[PDB]
Amino acid sequence: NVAHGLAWSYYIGYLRLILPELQARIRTYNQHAVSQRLYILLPLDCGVPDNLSMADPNIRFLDKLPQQTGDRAGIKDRVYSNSIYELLENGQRAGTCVLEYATPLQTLFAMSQYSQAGFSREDRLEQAKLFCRTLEDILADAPESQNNCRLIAYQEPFSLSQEVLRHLRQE
Amino acid sequence: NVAHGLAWSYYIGYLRLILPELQARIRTYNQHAVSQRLYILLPLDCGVPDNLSMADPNIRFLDKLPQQTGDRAGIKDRVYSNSIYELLENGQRAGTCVLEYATPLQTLFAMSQYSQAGFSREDRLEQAKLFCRTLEDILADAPESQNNCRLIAYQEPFSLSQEVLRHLRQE
Numbered sequence: 192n193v194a195h196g197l198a199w200s201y202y203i204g205y206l207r208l209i210l211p212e213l214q215a216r217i218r219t220y221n222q223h224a225v226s227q228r229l230y231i232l233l234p235l236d237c238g239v240p241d242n243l244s245m246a247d248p249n250i251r252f253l254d255k256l257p258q259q260t261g262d263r264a265g266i267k268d269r270v271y272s273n274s275i276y277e278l279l280e281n282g283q284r285a286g287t288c289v290l291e292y293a294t295p296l297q298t299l300f301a302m303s304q305y306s307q308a309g310f311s312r313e314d315r316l317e318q319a320k321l322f323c324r325t326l327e328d329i330l331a332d333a334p335e336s337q338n339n340c341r342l343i344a345y346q347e348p349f350s351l352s353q354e355v356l357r358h359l360r361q362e
Numbered sequence: 363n364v365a366h367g368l369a370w371s372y373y374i375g376y377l378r379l380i381l382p383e384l385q386a387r388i389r390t391y392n393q394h395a396v397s398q399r400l401y402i403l404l405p406l407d408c409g410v411p412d413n414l415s416m417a418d419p420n421i422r423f424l425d426k427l428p429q430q431t432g433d434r435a436g437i438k439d440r441v442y443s444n445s446i447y448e449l450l451e452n453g454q455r456a457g458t459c460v461l462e463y464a465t466p467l468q469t470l471f472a473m474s475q476y477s478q479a480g481f482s483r484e485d486r487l488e489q490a491k492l493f494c495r496t497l498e499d500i501l502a503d504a505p506e507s508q509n510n511c512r513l514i515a516y517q518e519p520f521s522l523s524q525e526v527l528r529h530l531r532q533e
């Protein structure tokens with residue numbers, strides 16, 4: 192349905208272009224340690240706050256990842272921005288990674304509240320699931336994701352910082 | 363179909379957030395003249411190059427518009443970038459505006475070349491048209507677009523700089 196298109200937009204205009212350069216940007220930050228993979232949080236309830244630190248205080252913002260620039264569809268040197276977070280566990284830095292929500296899920300939530308979008312509020316979870324299922328299929332066949340990306344789907348029924356650490360510790 | 367979702371993504375996560383601040387950013391640039399509207403080019407053939415100057419040399423890049431920052435889905439101070447262009451006509455500056463292609467049309471073109479996207483190459487024009495028709499409906503009912511945005515649909519069968527100037531001169 193709609194989720195099918197946003198998943199492809201998410202990969203065409205973002206992951207396909209910045210994943211090939213992520214390791215290089217992480218290397219640049221360490222010297223001039225952060226983990227070598229982009230962690231994407233996929234709350235299937237489509238509850239995407241704009242500040243990760245408020246969804247969980249154990250997720251502490253640290254610094255910005257070095258910018259990436261690319262001439263895109265008439266915008267000269269368009270900036271792409273990522274955020275580096277520290278994950279605390281009983282007041283102890285247990286990890287550090289490039290962490291972010293999947294913005295398109297936030298778009299699904301908004302589409303559902305607009306009247307003329309023809310998107311009922313009950314179809315959120317079904318679309319969030321189809322978005323996750325469509326993205327996994329793409330990245331399983333994507334060379335850009337040569338072990339450079341990890342998805343974190345979950346359904347708040349709970350510590351989000353613990354869920355991130357679980358995947359991070361297995362790295 | 364697919365175009366319906368990208369048009370809403372285009373408005374939810376971009377135009378709805380940066381149009382309320384465009385005039386202020388243009389004001390800041392003039393003093394610290396540029397036109398007071400964002401011009402979006404919608405080539406219905408989905409031919410979106412990344413450098414406007416090459417689609418037409420009479421379109422000359424000038425400078426960057428002052429950045430806009432916003433906490434978005436876990437990315438602290440995410441930068442939004444626009445480009446200011448000069449439109450030449452027989453070697454004379456005939457206009458100056460914030461000009462850019464509609465990136466989502468570029469995404470439609472790419473989706474059509476990927477095999478697993480289930481998007482045939484022949485459906486481009488139909489989707490580019492549905493994208494334009496869905497965006498016009500949104501902006502006709504959008505308060506954010508309080509005479510702050512102008513769409514430029516066209517089908518290359520021709521001077522793109524002349525097409526932009528035609529809309530710009532009527533402003």
Ligand SMILES: Nc1nc2c(ncn2[C@@H]2O[C@@H]3COP(=O)(O)O[C@H]4[C@@H](F)[C@H](n5cnc6c(=O)[nH]c(N)nc65)O[C@@H]4COP(=O)(O)O[C@H]3[C@H]2F)c(=O)[nH]1
Nearest residue numbers: 200201204205271272294295371372375376442443465466
């Ligand atoms: N973390 C991070 N994620 C990023 C970054 N860039 C993209 N993504 C992800 O990829 C999705 C699809 O990106 P696009 O194919 O480019 O389609 C965009 C584009 F057409 C327009 N748009 C957005 N920002 C700007 C801008 O600064 N300047 C101009 N001129 N246009 C802009 O709005 C559409 C929907 O944006 P949205 O944010 O909802 O979904 C994005 C987002 F999820 C990034 O820097 N950082």
